[PDB]
Amino acid sequence: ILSPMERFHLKYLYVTDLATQNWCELQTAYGKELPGFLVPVTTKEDAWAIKFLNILLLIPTLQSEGHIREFPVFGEVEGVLLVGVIDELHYTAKGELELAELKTRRRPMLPLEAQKKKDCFQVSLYKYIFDAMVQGKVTPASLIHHTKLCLEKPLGPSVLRHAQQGGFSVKSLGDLMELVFLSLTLSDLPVIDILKIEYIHQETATVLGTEIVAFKEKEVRAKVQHYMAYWMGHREPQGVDVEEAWKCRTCTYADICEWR
DNA sequence: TTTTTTTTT
Numbered sequence: 358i359l360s361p362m363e364r365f366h367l368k369y370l371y372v373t374d375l376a377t378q379n380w381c382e383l384q385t386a387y388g389k390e391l392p393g394f395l396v397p398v399t400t401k402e403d404a405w406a407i408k409f410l411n412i413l414l415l416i417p418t419l420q421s422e423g424h425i426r427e428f429p430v431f432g433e434v435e436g437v438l439l440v441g442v443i444d445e446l447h448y449t450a451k452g453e454l455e456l457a458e459l460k461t462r463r464r465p466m467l468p469l470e471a472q473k474k475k476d477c478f479q480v481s482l483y484k485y486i487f488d489a490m491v492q493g494k495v496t497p498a499s500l501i502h503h504t505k506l507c508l509e510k511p512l513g514p515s516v517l518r519h520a521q522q523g524g525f526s527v528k529s530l531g532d533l534m535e536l537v538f539l540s541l542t543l544s545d546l547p548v549i550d551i552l553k554i555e556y557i558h559q560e561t562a563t564v565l566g567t568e569i570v571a572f573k574e575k576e577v578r579a580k581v582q583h584y585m586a587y588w589m590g591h592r593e594p595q596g597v598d599v600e601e602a603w604k605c606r607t608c609t610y611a612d613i614c615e616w617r
Numbered sequence: 618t619t620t621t622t623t624t625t626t
């Protein structure tokens with residue numbers, strides 16, 4: 358009678374949350390039900406204000422220096438707000454906007470095909486959200502409705518300090534959101550042309566493989582439509598296929614999972 | 618709710 362978002366008290370979701378769902382949807386569900394395993398700010402209007410201030414600083418950096426790291430992304434995807442952080446964004450020598458996702462491994466082994474499908478899906482989500490932000494499909498009203506940010510509340514001295522040191526003078530969280538929308542959509546920010554995953558050995562720094570994700574919008578949209586169907590409560594969570602039963606060996610919830 | 622990172626007889 359209650360959806361998983363309501364039962365787990367989740368106002369939105371993380372990008373990796375849907376990536377774990379590609380690994381095993383039921384394992385992601387148990388991770389939210391039983392969490393016992395798995396700038397100074399004590400409020401959510403400031404925490405989102407800091408995220409906005411970083412966006413307003415990384416947009417001009419990317420458009421001049423041509424290389425930024427830790428770029429926040431957010432947006433509503435089939436009824437659920439999705440939040441994430443892109444690791445790297447830079448312009449190639451040819452002029453393409455590339456997304457670099459570095460994945461370090463302790464053992465020099467090639468990544469499993471099951472691991473790469475989870476990783477290919479994660480960066481595709483990053484592009485799915487990024488393309489929507491820079492094209493005007495992510496509005497401040499869309500953010501308020503899902504996060505329940507109170508714009509009437511003033512931002513604390515923690516943020517106004519971090520803002521005046523950056524040269525910008527914030528008055529309200531509302532004025533900050535309107536500049537973020539304008540800067541994202543009116544600064545010639547192109548779509549992401551290349552999605553590149555790289556697997557690196559932690560010690561020897563050996564390249565364990567390079568993945569250039571073949572992005573297909575209709576395929577990506579279809580999967581999150583299916584994945585969000587669980588979170589909104591329109592279907593029951595599903596475990597791994599019988600072929601991937603080796604995942605249940607290293608799963609924390611193997612001794613309570615009735616799928617197994 | 619500050620997102621994610623990384624798996625493994």
Ligand code: SF4
Pocket residue numbers: 381382383384385387596597604605606608609610611614615616617
């Ligand atoms: S035991 Fe297997 S099916 Fe059950 S949650 Fe873990 S990985 Fe998924």
